[PDB]
Structure formats: structure tokens, C-alpha cells
Design a protein around this nucleic acid. Structure first.
Lengths: 122, 209, 38, 176
RNA sequence: GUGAAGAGGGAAACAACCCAGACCGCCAGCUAAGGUCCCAAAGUCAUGGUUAAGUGGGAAACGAUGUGGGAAGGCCCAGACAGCCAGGAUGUUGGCUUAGAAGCAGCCAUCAUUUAAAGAAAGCGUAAUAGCUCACUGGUCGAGUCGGCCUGCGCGGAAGA
RNA sequence: CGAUGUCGGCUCAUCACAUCCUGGGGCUGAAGUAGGUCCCAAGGGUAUGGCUGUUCGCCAUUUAAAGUGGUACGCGAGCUGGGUUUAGAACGUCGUGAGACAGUUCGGUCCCUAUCUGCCGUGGGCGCUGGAGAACUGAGGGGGGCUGCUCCUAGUACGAGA
RNA sequence: UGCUGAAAGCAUCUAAGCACGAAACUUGCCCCGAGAUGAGUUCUCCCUGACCCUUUAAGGGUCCUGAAGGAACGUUGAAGA
């Protein structure tokens, strides 16, 4: 689940609507990803009225999956589709300004120290 | 040293403000008789009898109650003689109950297992079976044997082979305690333990760190 | 190292010894001399 | 047959208390030590200690020299001992001694924690000096060689436990 | 030649090889090659010799202070070997080539002294000086010691199903 | 020759070695960080997809790390039947011609009512010296086990410094 | 890796003698295990017959009297072919 060389849905504005996954990064020998994992993205069509350019590389975080969040809230938390939020590929934090839905407090992991400044559940 | 026996009663939730509800398993224990010790009088074995099992006899085995102490006889559903090491106890009458145990923080837990269906090789070892699509007649899930080529004239049993499983003891070297009631004889432990409702369990204070 | 087969000695600086089937040459001109035979 | 008949001649107060094969020794510099051999027969007098052959065993005068050697190395042990020669070298490296245990800082994630055998003690007159005291010539040389064994000197480093005797290996090249 | 187309005796199982030839019998009997500790009938024999590997009981080349018999060489009883004590100096800046040599990357010459005693060479230590181990020599303990030869015998050297 | 199913794959044992990461220790024309290079050590760990019927090899992407041989070229009464060498046919060449061809390509039906040994489970018998009920001990078997990063050692050792 | 010391007055990790050393080995702990005939060790329980026949330091029979144990019914089970 979550595949390389395969499209991923966008959960913020000005970052196009479908973007290509190339690497699922993450833990020791892992060939999959879930909510709050980080993904390496590549953009070919970009939609030039947004904030992203044609032929460029980005960093994203997984925010919606059908399997969802499993441990921290005493109940499973499922989401609709398979979607991510785009982040600056060096300087961190989002490149859009309108993240969709509530997101989740499971994103408060060791890989994020400034995410707590955003207006969702994070 | 101390130890008690009981049964798995079911699952509960303790709750937190961190949103986790936390699974906690309930056990109800019995008080321990500690009637007598077997200590070096003939043969080198040492053991302490906790007994505690009481079942209506008709039935119920004889020699497993054939050397009971100078007390009212209560046999069946438990004997739990095990093995004793470096305990220097009273040879007769060292009884204990839950007020000696309610201050315990971490426990060592033991029980018995049952078969995983047919066991064989698939449920015994978690193996994969041969496929039936575009090939193979009658040779899909058959259990196999220790087959090897005869060039050495002797057999080799290095392949993991078919048989039965369970009917044995299983143990936990540490489990955290959550809730205790020394009037209801209740011991509540963090997370899960083997078997289902009404299954017999043995519990004592942990000696592993 | 080098393992050799059967080795003749001809050096004052090698204070050669033998133990457990192997020879140590104990050099201080070139301490990297370590061949196990003699 | 060069020294196997040579009578040792011990000083006053050295009594060498003998019981058949068993030979014991004590003196002003060494606490009671026991020795035992089955290869050669030993007879003693007021100060002259004398080894020799056994019935049914062969070439006994070639073992009596060895049996004389190790025992006469205890006669000197219990009267004056041996001179100090063991030292510690390295930045921050230091030794301390509490009863039978030597505590040694050697650039490791533990303090070595070295324990002594029976009939041997240790003293550090300075944090870099080690004086081993017993009655057997073997135990001091064994413990010195076991202290020597920790890391060993390393070719560009030269650090650890060393003797009061310079060894002809030192590097001064090359820099990358 | 032998088997082929031959019984018996010997030989781990391997026609041939080695003994000797197979008419029949017995309350018998002798040797042949071969064998004689156990297993398997007969010496754990007597005597002489050598070997120590735990060999012989798989092995070439080869190396190393393993060992008897025999014959010689070097050194040797004011005295050898090993050892310990004591030297480690001078004439002299080592000639040729040269970038380069305090003997010590190439070439090869050539004589002495102070002295109880120390090398234009044996090998290092360096920028040199220093200094160190030997050659050589002295003091001292005290009998074989060195390196080879003949005739014999050990050790490893020696990696796969 | 009076009959040994051959090579590739799926499936699983047994032995060995001059070793890919891991054990124990040295060397460098090694200061330290690392790769490198040798000796004993084969106990532990032991990548997949792509071209092919496979391999060699090339290719793609991971990782601490992508070692190998022997065994009826290990195992077709466990499975598969693409390769290849006797149905058949086509593109092409060549011969006087049946045809030939690693010159290709497409195909060409390798199978099975386990006697009896072994193995697994499970009943029954039997010797332990009167007979039964139940345990303790452990000849012996199975499990063990490999690795990044990060905290601590310590920004110490080494090094202008990096 | 070593200690001490002869053969070889030195030296020597072996001769006499002594201390170490791998992830592996023997073992820890968990399970299985005395068909382990090499039959181990222990705790527990129970039966106190007569006469006759066949040459027999062992059997055969008829009654008397019966123990620990065992067989096993159909209700049936997470024991399950």
C-alpha cells in the first residue's frame, strides 16, 4: 500500500491534483507507507496557476488512507481515498495554504517540530 | 516465594485523556493452601505443593491426592507441584492469600495450549501450500514427508515434518499489573493473555527485569 | 603473511621461534615479515 | 648436570618446611607459599636444599635443575623480592588499588576491573606505576603479561601497560 | 608362465601371484608357502640392533640446534662452545661516478697505530654528534663444541566432496 | 540396446571450501573516518524485477550484505513440461533430389488403482521377575544466532583543520 | 595471547608444570523424551485358598473366595479422522 511510480492525490491548494510518487522513504527495509509517513514526489503537468513548476521534485506527508490511524485514539480513524500534503523540499512546512479536512495528531512524530504551528488537529 | 492460580474472566478498558482506551484483561484468583514441601528425604528432588484445585470426585485421580497433608482433602483441577530451588520454607503449613499479593507491580504468568486445527505442517509451522491453477492434480495441501534422494543409504529428518501441537505449557516472564481487588480476588493485567474466557492460569511476582 | 612450504633462515635480526606447528620470525628491520614456516 | 646438585644455601630465618613431596616457604618479605612435585625427590638440611632422581623414572638430573630454579626464585622472593619494572602510559590513563582489585582507566567504556590471583597483591606509588608483590616468580610475570594484554601498544600509539625496557618499534610517518 | 578348462593351504573382498596338486576311507600323522598380542589355532619367546613420531599404518620437492654405529676436519685443558663483566678509540674527510655515502642504492680499491683492547668492513642509529649489537680482544666458570661426511632411523612439508 | 524420463522453473535435504556482511587478530607506500589487504574461522545472515526455456552477461532498483562448489550434471510414482533430437508446417536459402539447416520460428498430449521397507500420526502387543496408579532424573532431539540508526563512551583518541 | 624454565649453563608458549582464548562446542531456560531392553530413581495402592492330577525346584483342573487395577454404556467434548 502506497506504491512507487504511481499517482497520489493532493490535500492542499496550488500544488496540482495528482502527483507522481517515486520513493516511500521511511523505516528499515520498508516497501510501503501509512498516515504520517514522508514521500518523495515528482511533478510533470504542475497546473501553472498554482505555486509549483513543471519538471520539479517535492517532499510530501501522507494524510488520508483507507487503513488510516490505528493506535493513539482507542479507535481506528479511517479517511477517504489516498492523499498527501506537499511541503518545501528543503525549508519544511506546507507550500499551499488550504489543507483539506482535520488531519490527525498522529503527525506529531519525531520527524516534525514546526507542524504544531498549523491550524488542523496537528 | 509466592504464587497463585485463577481463570481468565474477560476484557476491560481503563481510559486516558491521551485518547487511548487501553485494553486490560481480568483474572480471578484463588487463595493458596501451601500444605506441604517435598525436601530431600529420599531422592534429590525438591518441590512445594500449592494444590488449590478442588473438583467433585467420582472420578478424579487417586495417586495425585494419595499423599495429601493432615487437612481436609480437596483434589482435582490442579496440583501444580512444579520444581523448588533455594527456597528454605516451613515443611508443613505456609498458606497465603491476596493481601500478601495486592502490593505486587509486575507478574510472571503460565498456562496451557490447545491444537491449531489439524496442526500438520501448515498450522504447525505457518508454511505455504502448492498452487492448483494451470497445473497440479491432488497434490496441493497434502502434508508431505522427510523425502530425500538415496545416495547416502540413511534417512535425514532435517525438513520440518508433520505432527501434533499444543497440549503443553506456555509462559510470560513479565506482565504489568493495572487494577487489584483483594476482596473480590481480582487481578487486572496490562494487555492480553493466552486462551479465552474460563481458561485456567498460574500467576506469581516477576523475577526478570 | 605468505605461507611458503619449507623455509631456510639467514638473518641475525630474526630471533625465530616455533610453537604449535607454526614459526614466528620476530623481525625488527621489517616487522611485516610474518611467514608461518621454518 | 651443572647445578642439579648445587645446594642453594639459604640465609638465616629461611627454614623451608618440607613434608615428603610438599615444600613450603615463608620469610620477612613473603607470606606462606606451598609447592608440590612428583618428578624428582627432594631432601633438606639446616640451609642446604638437595634434589635428585626417583626410582622407575628416567633422566632425573635434567628435571632437578628446573625444580631447583623455581624454588630458589621463592627464596629471594620471601627475603627481598624483585625490583619494580611495570608502568602505565597514555593520556588520562591511571591506576588505583582496593584490596585484591585494580581499577584502571584505559580509554574504554568500562574501568577494566582487574582481580588478582591468590598469593599476589598490587601497589601504585604513583598513578602511572604498578608494583606486584608475592612469593612465586610466575604470578607477578603472569599478571604483568595480562595487564600488558589490554589493547596492546598499537603501532602509531605506543600506549597501555609497558615495562621499564624500551622495545625497538616506533613510527613517525607519513600524513595524508 | 598362469588362469582359461584345478579341489586344498596363503593373501581383507580383487581368474592371474605364492605353496602344492585334488581316487575313496580313518576315535590317525608330517611338513610346505604362510603364521604364532586380541579378535582367529601357534612365542605379548630368547637374543642382538635402531627408531620416541605416538610412529610404522598413502605421498614428491624441501627445510630445521630430533638420534645410535663408523671415519676425519676447525677450536681445546692458563683452557674451547654457550654466558656474564669490560671495550666500542686514532692516523682517516673512503677512492671512482654523482644526484648521492660517516663501509653499507652503482663501481672497487688497500696500509698502519695507541693498547691490556676495539674492522677503509658486519648491521644499524642520524642532520650530524651521541649511541647500540657483533668482528676482534681481555677477565672468569670448566669438556666437549661447531659445520660437514659415510651408514641407518624420526619431524613436518600436506587443500573438497 | 532384453527400455537409466534429459536440460530450465516451483518444492526440500546433505556435505565442503582458498569468504559477500558478521567472529577473533595483524599489515600497508596505514595519523585519524572508511574502503583496501592477509591468517584462523563455513557458527549466524544469504535481494528481486527486466531480456531468455535458463545460465553467462548486460539492465533496473534496493541493502548491513547481495560468495561458491560437490550430491545418478541432488530430488519428474511431490508439481511443471517452455529448452532439446524422429507428429506437423512456414519465412528464407541451398541441391539433380527424398529434403537440409545454432538459419529461424510455430507447435509436436513425461505417465501411475503404493504390494513391501522408511517417515508422520495413532491403536494393539510385549520384556523388565507378584500386579497396577502416578511422577522425578535426562541418554537424546527441537529452539538459540544476523543488522542499520541513535543515545552513552566522546566531539575524548588522531588530525592546522576538514 | 601468555607465564616460568630444561633439552641447547643462552634463548625457548612444552620437556615437568601453571593462567587465558570464538559468534561455535558442553550447558543455562522452554518443550518432547527411560522402547534409554544401558530396562535408572521415587511416591502411592492392593490381593494371606483347599483338594485332586501329570514326575514336577514346574504345570493341568474343579470349586471356595475376591483386591488395586481394567473392560465399557450413550449423554457427549476445545479429545476430535
Amino acid at each position: 500500500m502506497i506504491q512507487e511510480q504511481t499517482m497520489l492525490n493532493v490535500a492542499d491548494n496550488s500544488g496540482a491534483r495528482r502527483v507522481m510518487c517515486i520513493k516511500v522513504l521511511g523505516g528499515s527495509h520498508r516497501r510501503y507507507a501509512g498516515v504520517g509517513d514522508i514521500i518523495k514526489i515528482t511533478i510533470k503537468e504542475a497546473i501553472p496557476r498554482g505555486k509549483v513548476k513543471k519538471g520539479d521534485v517535492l517532499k510530501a506527508v501522507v494524510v488520508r488512507t483507507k487503513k488510516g490511524v490505528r493506535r493513539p485514539d482507542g479507535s481506528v480513524i479511517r479517511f477517504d481515498g489516498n492523499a498527501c500534503v506537499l511541503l518545501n523540499n528543503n525549508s519544511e512546512q506546507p507550500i499551499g495554504t488550504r489543507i483539506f479536512g482535520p488531519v490527525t495528531r498522529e503527525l506529531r512524530s519525531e520527524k516534525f517540530m514546526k507542524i504544531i504551528s498549523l491550524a488542523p488537529e496537528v | 516465594m509466592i504464587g497463585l492460580v485463577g481463570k481468565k474472566v474477560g476484557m476491560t478498558r481503563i481510559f486516558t485523556e491521551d485518547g487511548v482506551s487501553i485494553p486490560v484483561t481480568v483474572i480471578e484468583v484463588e487463595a493458596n493452601r501451601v500444605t506441604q514441601v517435598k525436601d530431600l528425604a529420599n531422592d534429590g528432588y525438591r518441590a512445594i505443593q500449592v494444590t488449590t484445585g478442588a473438583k467433585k470426585a467420582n472420578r478424579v485421580t487417586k495417586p495425585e491426592a494419595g499423599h495429601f497433608a493432615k487437612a481436609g482433602v480437596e483434589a482435582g483441577r490442579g496440583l501444580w507441584e512444579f520444581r523448588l530451588a533455594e527456597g528454605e520454607e516451613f515443611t508443613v503449613g505456609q498458606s497465603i492469600s491476596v493481601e500478601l499479593f495486592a502490593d505486587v507491580k509486575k507478574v510472571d504468568v503460565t498456562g496451557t495450549s490447545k491444537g491449531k486445527g489439524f496442526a500438520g505442517t501448515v498450522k504447525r509451522w505457518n508454511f505455504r501450500t502448492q498452487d492448483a491453477t494451470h497445473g497440479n492434480s491432488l497434490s496441493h495441501r497434502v502434508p508431505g514427508s522427510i523425502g530425500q534422494n538415496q545416495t547416502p543409504g540413511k534417512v535425514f529428518k532435517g525438513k520440518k515434518m508433520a505432527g501434533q501441537m499444543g497440549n503443553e505449557r506456555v509462559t510470560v516472564q513479565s506482565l504489568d499489573v493495572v487494577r487489584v481487588d483483594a476482596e473480590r480476588n481480582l487481578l487486572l493485567v496490562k494487555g492480553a493473555v493466552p486462551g479465552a474466557t474460563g481458561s485456567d492460569l498460574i500467576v506469581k511476582p516477576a523475577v526478570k527485569a | 603473511m605468505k605461507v611458503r612450504a619449507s623455509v631456510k633462515k639467514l638473518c641475525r635480526n630474526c630471533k625465530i621461534v616455533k610453537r604449535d606447528g607454526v614459526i614466528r620470525v620476530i623481525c625488527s628491520a621489517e616487522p611485516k615479515h610474518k611467514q608461518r614456516q621454518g | 648436570s651443572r647445578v642439579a646438585k648445587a645446594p642453594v644455601v639459604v640465609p638465616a630465618g629461611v627454614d623451608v618446611k618440607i613434608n615428603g613431596q610438599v615444600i613450603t616457604i615463608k620469610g620477612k618479605n613473603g607470606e606462606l607459599t606451598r609447592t608440590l612435585n612428583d618428578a624428582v625427590e627432594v631432601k633438606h638440611a639446616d640451609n642446604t636444599l638437595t634434589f635428585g632422581p626417583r626410582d622407575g623414572y628416567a633422566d632425573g638430573w635434567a628435571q632437578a635443575g628446573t625444580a631447583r630454579a623455581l624454588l630458589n626464585s621463592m627464596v629471594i622472593g620471601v627475603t627481598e623480592g624483585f625490583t619494580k619494572k611495570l608502568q602505565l602510559v597514555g593520556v588520562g590513563y591511571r591506576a588505583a588499588v582496593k584490596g585484591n582489585v585494580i581499577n584502571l582507566s584505559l580509554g574504554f567504556s568500562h574501568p577494566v576491573d582487574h582481580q588478582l590471583p591468590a598469593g599476589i597483591t598490587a601497589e601504585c606509588p604513583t598513578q602511572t606505576e604498578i608494583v606486584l608483590k608475592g612469593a612465586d616468580k610466575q604470578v607477578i610475570g603472569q599478571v604483568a603479561a595480562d595487564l600488558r594484554a589490554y589493547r596492546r601498544p598499537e603501532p602509531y600509539k605506543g600506549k597501555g601497560v609497558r615495562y621499564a625496557d624500551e622495545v625497538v618499534r616506533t613510527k613517525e610517518a607519513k600524513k595524508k
